[PDB]
Design a protein around this ligand. Sequence first.
Ligand SMILES: *[C@@H]1O[C@H](CO)[C@@H](O[C@@H]2O[C@H](CO)[C@@H](O)[C@H](O)[C@H]2NC(C)=O)[C@H](O)[C@H]1NC(C)=O
Ligand SMILES: *[C@@H]1O[C@H](CO)[C@@H](O[C@@H]2O[C@H](CO)[C@@H](O)[C@H](O)[C@H]2NC(C)=O)[C@H](O)[C@H]1NC(C)=O
Ligand SMILES: *[C@@H]1O[C@H](CO)[C@@H](O)[C@H](O)[C@H]1NC(C)=O
Lengths: 49, 55, 6
Amino acid sequence: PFAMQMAYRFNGIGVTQNVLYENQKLIANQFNSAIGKIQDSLSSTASAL
Amino acid sequence: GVFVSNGTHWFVTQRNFYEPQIITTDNTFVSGNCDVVIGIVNNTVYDPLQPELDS
Amino acid sequence: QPELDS
Ligand SMILES: *[C@@H]1O[C@H](CO)[C@@H](O[C@@H]2O[C@H](CO)[C@@H](O)[C@H](O)[C@H]2NC(C)=O)[C@H](O)[C@H]1NC(C)=O
Ligand SMILES: *[C@@H]1O[C@H](CO)[C@@H](O[C@@H]2O[C@H](CO)[C@@H](O)[C@H](O)[C@H]2NC(C)=O)[C@H](O)[C@H]1NC(C)=O
Ligand SMILES: *[C@@H]1O[C@H](CO)[C@@H](O)[C@H](O)[C@H]1NC(C)=O
């Protein structure tokens, strides 16, 4: 499962996995906002590529 | 490792080779209470010292 | 074990 995958990747950078599990909804909301910022930066620019 | 169920009983095992162990307090660590983990499961955690330190 | 046998 994807949240257990993300917990083990938190464990890989030296953060304990309870930090992920206790902040799961905040971490998923920060991720969805950053994906939206990528999308509208590519809908509003000139020369990224 | 990860908590796994064989169908009735819960164990802990390493991720790359199946080798199940009894869930004790040397296997695990405590953090917080049970209402802030999506998907938490009720089970028992064995003390590996106290049934034969009761002297 | 072999010292805290209280
Ligand atoms: C899951 O593991 C448990 C514990 O190792 C198994 O329980 C044992 O089952 C056998 C026969 O079914 C009994 O002779 C033992 O006494 C049981 N041990 C305990 C501690 O209860 C259980 O059978 C396993 N389940 C599956 C589906 O493999
Ligand atoms: C796991 O065990 C706990 C008790 O240790 C159960 O929590 C109770 O659940 C009922 C049903 O909603 C509540 O009325 C009680 O107030 C709860 N107790 C406490 C102390 O909060 C819980 O239901 C069990 N989980 C499952 C899936 O059965
Ligand atoms: C897994 O999905 C079931 C429904 O299929 C749901 O009831 C349960 O809350 C989910 N568990 C987790 C840990 O997300």
